[PDB]
Amino acid sequence: DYNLTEEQKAIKAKYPPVNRKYEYLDHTAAVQLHAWGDTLEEAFEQCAMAMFGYMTDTGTVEPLQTVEVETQGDDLQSLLFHFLDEWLYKFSADEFFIPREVKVLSIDQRNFKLRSIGWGEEFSLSKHPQGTEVKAITYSAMQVYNEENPEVFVIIDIL
Template identity: 55%
Template structure:
């Protein structure tokens, strides 16, 4: 699988992961939205920031079923470019047909020395009748992007262009 290549497959109900605890918040930002996530480790904070982005994009995230698996890969030249490319891969997953909205995201490989991520999104195709749209995310930005590793809560801050 090449960087950015997506692999899709079906999920049986007994294979669906549990819904993680919410560890994110939305912070007001002029004409944009800032995501603030935290976790027990940086990997969890990265998972949370992708979930926060998708939750912001739909008004009823609880209706998203985990019937499909979507795998992504991302690389970067440093931690910020890795975070940017990781979120951009998931945003592309939502923007390309069929529009996919993951409910749970699990990072399966997190290499912070070589700046590589492999992740799985559990979700389903986006359906406007079932998943009322929230705010469209146009792009991920580097503006005020922050990654705090080895702090008690491993915070990540990302501003989305909406």
């Protein structure tokens, strides 16, 4: 499964081949997003911007369009999960939208309701740099530090 130099190919043919009786399965990968802000709404919105920043350079997205994502949860952690998941879906399913920026307009901390919007356009390999695909959001070692200088830690599955 490798690209070889003519030199390396020389080696291989020189020696008896080895019988292989094995295979590789279930390759998995993940990365932990850490985001922060002056408010809890800033930390979530930065978190969504981190996620998308791992899919491309958002600096190259034009804010042609606007999208709104509204969601809710049982607690802040679930709220963050859904918040990220809905956004991911907007990218994943047609329209395959990607925001240049996200802004969280409001978070209700009693009932765990959230309003956000993002501005950008249709994602395209011809137009926009390629980075890593994002497979899913995960509750793995998820933290919401709702306090002075809020911080958010989220693990996402990738390729």
